[PDB]
Paper text:
A key component in the generation of cellular metabolic energy is the F1Fo ATP synthase, a biological rotary motor that converts the proton motive force (pmf) to adenosine tri-phosphate (ATP) in both oxidative phosphorylation and photophosphorylation. The enzyme is comprised of two rotary motors, termed F1 and Fo, that are coupled together by two stalks: a central “rotor” stalk and a peripheral “stator” stalk. The Fo motor spans the membrane and converts the potential energy from the pmf into mechanical rotation of the central rotor that, in turn, drives conformational changes in the catalytic F1 motor subunits to generate ATP from ADP and inorganic phosphate (Pi).
The three major rotational states identified previously (termed States: “State 1”, “State 2”, and “State 3”, assigned to describe the enzyme operating in an ATP hydrolysis direction), in which the central stalk is rotated by ~120° relative to peripheral stalk, were also obtained in this study with resolutions of 2.9, 3.1, and 3.0 Å, respectively. Hence, masked classification focused on the Fo stator was used on each of the main states to reveal sub-states describing movements of the complex along with increased detail in the Fo region. Importantly, this rotation describes a ~36° movement of the c-ring in the Fo motor without any corresponding rotation within the F1 motor: the α3β3γεc10 subunits are rotating as a rigid body relative to the Fo stator, with the movement mediated mainly by changes in the peripheral stalk. The focused classifications of States 2 and 3 also revealed sub-states, however these showed only torsional flexing similar to that seen in Sub-states 1 B-E, and hence no movement of the c-ring was observed within sub-states of States 2 and 3. Thus, across our maps of E. coli ATP synthase, the rotor (consisting of the subunits γεc10) was observed in four discrete rotational positions relative to the Fo stator: one in each of States 2 and 3, and two in State 1. By contrast, in States 2 and 3 the spring is close to its relaxed energy state in the observed single Fo rotary states, and the adjacent Fo rotary states are inaccessible because thermal excitation is insufficient to stretch the spring through the required 1/10 of a revolution. The maps presented here were generated from material imaged in the presence of 10 mM MgADP and all showed the enzyme in the “autoinhibited” state, with the C-terminal domain of the ε subunit (εCTD) in the “up” inhibited position interacting with the F1 catalytic subunits.
Author numbering:
A (entry chain P), E (entry chain O), F (entry chain N), G (entry chain S), H (entry chain R), I (entry chain M), ...: 3 to 79
B (entry chain a): 4 to 269
C (entry chain Y), N (entry chain X): 1 to 52
D (entry chain H): 3 to 69
The structure:
């Protein structure tokens, strides 16, 4: 018994917290992007360039946690 | 059909694997255990896409006019300019090698993600029913294998540029002094900068893996769990949404690859 | 338990998806490619008139 | 009540003791009652509403300015 | 056996956290969008277009967690 | 028996978190809508239109989570 | 009996988290309503009408979670 | 038996979550009330009137949860 | 017997959550109070009067839950 | 015996949440205080005064919790 | 016996919550301190004096919880 | 035997928490960066370098929770 | 048996929380540092000096909680 | 899911396509575009000289 289900619960923790961290952090960054864009429309291609530049750092560790949660669900269990 | 849906979902995930010892097309009922079992589907579809990209672009690179371009040429030069601009703005060193690497990543990853869009059972149906082949799954990017192979390639390049442009003394001084730059805390900096370095490729590989694997798994589930008539209404939204996923995950991989190398050389 | 009927459901969704892409996604791309041809053509025509 | 001056570079347009004004400030319409905290804003063109003391309303048209 | 309900409780946690993350992240992004829309009404179609691009990022991880929940609830149990 | 019982606990976490996520996301978005409406009264119906559009994106995942909470509590019950 | 007592805990989570969701969601919304009133005392009714409209959306899922909390706690017990 | 202290924990859950919900909801709304007062320190009675109007709503669900916490705390628990 | 353990635990949770709720709710209200004061000290005693008028409400459910928490811990033991 | 474990756990969680509450409640208030001082440098002693006035309210329930935490850990256990 | 490992888990959570509470509280205070320093940099020694004064008031409950956590880990366990 | 598996339930906590810490920690930081970039759009390449300097300090303690989390899962078991 | 495992789970909870505390505290402090610097580039070296000074305080209590996680795994084990 | 030899297989295919694209595609296309850009801009040189 105790082999399977705890790994499913561990994965459910990893992937749930990774979705919380990613979706709030990306929402905040995108909000500040839209505020700048509404102020400075000519900048929108410049600002969206900087948005993607910064955004790539935000989910890097949440994607670590999702990749390992997939490994524990599919690879081990 | 004798397939239980509960196991139909599983068989999909199982790869076609070639055992370096037996050279045998394994099937989902029993998985053998060794490292040397290449995932046949991934290599073949990956090189098919990457060589198709190289041939189409080489054929225009051979013809290419400085007059009014053909419409097809216009789309190719459009994306050439799209990449060139992104490189020029992000990277301010000389090296010739950055731009083609970025172009290969962007188009090849875009094509690999695009591979997922085609209906999940259609090629497995062709393989099993007509061609009698034992297994198939078509998307390279769904694997960890391809995504870590690429990310480790970029990690090597980081080491190459950082020793080329500023060398061992600068590189080690950054790793040892920065962040604090305080000689009293060098061991802490050594940990923090090592794990910061290693975080960049592992995150690169796992982001793309996790997105494309779960997208495939959704298509598998929709095909497996629901009644087929009901499946169209749910499947159309996910396919549309997935278009945006496949595009942004390719774009983001290219963008970060450039940023990490520009940060490494400067 | 019809792999076919589920393949029928896939075929419905996939044709719906293509029809959407052709009405809504490809024409925006072709319009930009045609705008690029336009900018190239006008650039060359104005360069010839300055040479004259 | 509070003392309001409306003044142009050329001339004075109003002076008096006022109960309230309603004003189309640039970032959305505004209202000034007595004791209102110190504030500074540009305004858009349009009718300002004046409520003089003993409630006697009158309008003024402003082409812009700073409040 | 009692393995089933632990798998259900894991999936329940994972979907709950994914709905919190999605709802808050989009809620913030939409709030800053509406501020921009109030300032620049002629811009709102353009800002609405740019708003969907980042909204797709914000939802990407939540859709992973929803898919894995559905796998555990429907397919494993 | 407990197989039956813990499924109410799972439904409770699913529905509680979906309620928190929905009510917070809509509350933030509505606050920014009321701030715009107070500033720009003539814009009120146009902003109302955009508010409903973006509210429909905010509520999708909470409604998935309550849809599963109702499936669990009535179907596996 | 072993069954009903745990169901008091499942009601306690459903009704508690629905309380957090409705309380904070409406607290934020009403705060922005008060800002709008303080700028425009002359428009205080019109904004109150818009507040009540959006307040009716915000509490919809909390009303679901409490309605079923009452069903589980009193009626299924 | 195990029932009694479990039901007191269930009440303690509902009282904790209702205290959090009410205290944050009213603190946010009251903060916006005080800034609105500091803006127009002569309109305090009107703003206080509208503040109590919305306060009754933000309290409504918390006061349900406290009443039920009370119900179990002195009846079944 | 065991009953002491869960009664002390229920007191610790119920008062710990009431403590967070009151601490942050007053910290937020006080933040807006001190901002409004620093903008114009002449108002400070009027703002102080209205601040305490509001602060009396934020404390309601926290102090109720403390009253029940002390009753449980000492009297029910 | 088994009483020790849950007494120590109760007092730990009780006082952890008290640290969470009081440190954030004063962090926020201290932030708006330091904004005020950096906007308005003369008022500082009057700002410091009224800051201390409200600081005494934030600590009220956290100090109860910490006082009761020492009681559990050293007077009972 | 079981006894010691629960005491380790209790000290672990007590100091983990102390670390969150103090780190975020000092982050918020430090942020408003830095914006103030950027506004009036000739006041940095006075702002340092006040920042340290307030920092002494924030950390008191965290350092109390640290003290108990360290006593339980080294002395009791 | 659970001696191989509860490590993985612990590891899901370790890095899952750190992921929300890092992702929201970067997400806030990137948010303030983008606003300044819209205010100082010429200065951005300076700003981006200063962003990377301070971002480089965000990593460390999330990175330890990741590294020890992986080490617990694959070095310790 | 699992006596030794719970010490790893205690280390995990302690380090996971300390990672949240430090990562958010530095995320906010660094954000306000960036906005200050964007407004005043001549100040950037002075601001960065005060940033490193305040960051030392932010880090110290997370540092002790992480050192206790390391001592639990390595030294007590 | 698990680790595999395929990672090395893809790494070889990747570095080959990297060098092939680098030499053959990239300078030829960028040279074609910049040769067009040159002949268009030198048409302005015609006007600068003619006007002077």
């Amino acid at each position: 018994n105790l082999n399977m289900d705890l790994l499913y619960m561990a994965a459910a923790v990893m992937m749930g917290l990774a979705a919380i961290g990613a979706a709030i952090g990306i929402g905040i960054l995108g909000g500040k992007f839209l505020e700048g864009a509404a102020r400075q429309p000519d900048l929108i291609p410049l600002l969206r360039t900087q948005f993607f530049i910064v955004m790539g750092l935000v989910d890097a560790i949440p994607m670590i946690a999702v990749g390992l949660g997939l490994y524990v669900m599919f690879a081990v269990a | 059909e004798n397939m239980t849906p509960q196991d139909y979902i599983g068989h999909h995930l199982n790869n076609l694997q070639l055992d370096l010892r037996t050279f045998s097309l394994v099937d989902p009922q029993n998985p053998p255990a060794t490292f040397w079992t290449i995932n046949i589907d991934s290599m073949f579809f990956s090189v098919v896409l990457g060589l198709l990209f190289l041939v189409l672009f080489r054929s225009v690179a051979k013809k290419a006019t400085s007059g009014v371009p053909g419409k097809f040429q216009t789309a190719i030069e459009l994306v050439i300019g799209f990449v060139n601009g992104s490189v020029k703005d992000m990277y301010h060193g000389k090296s010739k090698l950055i731009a083609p690497l970025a172009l290969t990543i962007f188009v090849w990853v875009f094509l690999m993600n695009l591979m997922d869009l085609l209906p999940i059972d259609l090629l497995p149906y062709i393989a099993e029913h007509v061609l009698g082949l034992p297994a198939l799954r078509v998307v390279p990017s769904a694997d960890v294998n391809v995504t870590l192979s690429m990310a480790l390639g970029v990690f090597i390049l980081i080491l190459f540029y950082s020793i080329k442009m500023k060398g061992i003394g600068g590189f080690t001084k950054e790793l040892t002094l920065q962040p604090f730059n305080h000689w009293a805390f060098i061991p802490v900096n050594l940990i923090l900068e090592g794990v910061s370095l290693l975080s960049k490729p592992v995150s690169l590989g796992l982001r793309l893996f996790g997105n494309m694997y779960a997208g495939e798994l959704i298509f598998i589930l929709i095909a497996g769990l629901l009644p087929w008539w009901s499946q169209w209404i749910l499947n159309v939204p996910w396919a549309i949404f997935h278009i945006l996923i496949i595009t942004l995950q390719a774009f983001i991989f290219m963008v970060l690859t450039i940023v990490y190398l520009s940060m490494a050389s400067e | 338990m019809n792999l076919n009927a589920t393949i029928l459901g896939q075929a419905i969704a996939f044709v719906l998806f293509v029809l959407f892409a052709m009405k809504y996604v490809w024409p925006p791309l072709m319009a930009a490619i045609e705008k690029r041809q336009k900018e190239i053509a006008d650039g060359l025509a104005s360069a010839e008139r300055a040479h004259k | 009540t509070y003392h309001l001056d409306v003044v142009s570079a050329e001339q004075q347009m109003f002076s008096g003791l006022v109960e309230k004004i309603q004003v189309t400030g640039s970032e959305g319409e505004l209202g000034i009652y007595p004791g209102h905290a110190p504030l500074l804003t540009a305004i858009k063109p349009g009718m300002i509403r004046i409520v003089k003391q003993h409630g006697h309303e009158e309008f003024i048209y402003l082409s812009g300015g700073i409040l």
